[PDB]
C-alpha cells in the first residue's frame with residue numbers, strides 16, 4: 001500500500017496534464033506535456049521514483065504499459081508496472097472527480113499565472129496542502145514513516 | 150529544521166543544474182535548466198513547495214534573493230526567503246562535496262541516458278536511495294513525520 005501509485009492523464013487548453021496519485025493518501029505530482037508519449041511518461045516516472053518510494057505503478061493506458069521506453073524506465077527505477085484496470089469500480093470515479101477538482105483550481109488561479117504549467121503546479125500545491133483534518137501531504141508522510149519503522 | 154531547504158546551482162556540459170537540498174536529511178530534488186533566471190528559480194520553488202512542506206529557503210545567490218519573480222513565488226507558496234550565507238562554514242564544503250558526488254553519478258550513467266536531464270534524474274534517484282544506516286529519503290520522511298506528530 002505505501003508504494004502504490006496510479007498514473008492519470010487529463011486534458012486542458014489542448015495540452016496534456018500527466019498526474020501520479022499516491023493511492024493510499026490522495027497525494028499527487030503533475031506536469032504539463034505537449035503530448036502523452038512513452039518517452040514523456042518514462043521520464044515522469046523516473047522523476048517520481050527518485051522523489052518517493054515507488055514500488056508499483058498502475059499505468060493509465062495500454063500504450064504506456066506496452067511502451068519499451070516506459071518498461072525501460074520502470075526496470076531502471078525498480079518499479080513493478082501493473083495495469084490500471086479498476087477491479088474496484090469506484091476507482092474511475094475517484095480519478096474523474098480529482099481531474100474535475102484540479103481543473104477547477106487551475107481555473108481559480110488563472111489571474112495569477114501567465115503559463116498553464118505554473119497554474120498546474122499551483123493546483124498541485126493547493127491539492128496536497130488542503131485539509132480534509134489531515135492533508136494528503138501529511139497522510140503520505142505518515143503512511144511511509146509507519147512503513148519504514 | 151524540518152522545513153529548511155537550501156538552493157544550489159551547479160554546472161555541467163555548458164548547462165545549469167538547479168538543486169534543492171533538505172538541510173536536515175540530505176534529500177534532494179534537481180532539474181536541468183538552460184540558464185539560472187529568476188523565472189526558472191521561481192517555478193522550481195513552486196514545484197518543490199507543492200511536493201514537500203517548505204518553510205524556509207536559503208537562496209543560492211543574491212540575484213535570486215532579489216528577483217521579483219522569486220519573491221512572488223515565495224509569497225505565493227508561503228515560503229520565507231533567507232540568504233544562503235554559510236554563517237556555519239562547514240555548510241559550503243558539504244555543498245561542494247554534493248555537487249562532486251552528483252556529477253560523478255551523472256558520469257556513471259552515460260551509457261544509459263541519452264539526455265543530460267535523464268542522467269540528472271537518475272542521479273537524484275541514486276542519491277536519495279543511497280544507504281549511508283538509513284537513506285536520505287528515509288531521513289526526510291522520519292523528520293517530517295516526527296514534526297506532524
Ligand SMILES: CN(Cc1ccc2c(c1C(=O)O)OCO2)C(=O)N[C@H](C(=O)NCc1ccccc1)c1ccccc1
Nearest residue numbers: 110111112113114115118188189191192218221222225
Ligand atoms: C509567481 N509568478 C508565477 C510564475 C513564476 C515563474 C514563472 C512563470 C510564472 C507565471 O506566472 O506563469 O512563468 C514561467 O516562470 C509570477 O510572478 N507571475 C508573473 C506575473 O506577472 N503574474 C501575473 C500575470 C498573470 C496573468 C498574465 C500575466 C501576468 C510572471 C513572471 C514571469 C513571467 C510571467 C509572469
Ligand SMILES: CN(Cc1ccc2c(c1C(=O)O)OCO2)C(=O)N[C@H](C(=O)NCc1ccccc1)c1ccccc1
Nearest residue numbers: 039040042043069072073076259260261262263264267
Ligand atoms: C529509460 N531511458 C532513459 C530515457 C527515458 C525517457 C526519455 C529519455 C531517456 C534518455 O535516455 O535520455 O529521453 C527522453 O525521454 C531509455 O529507455 N533511454 C532510451 C535509450 O535508448 N537509452 C540508451 C542510450 C544511451 C546513450 C545514448 C543513446 C541511447 C531512449 C529513449 C528515448 C529517447 C532517447 C533514448
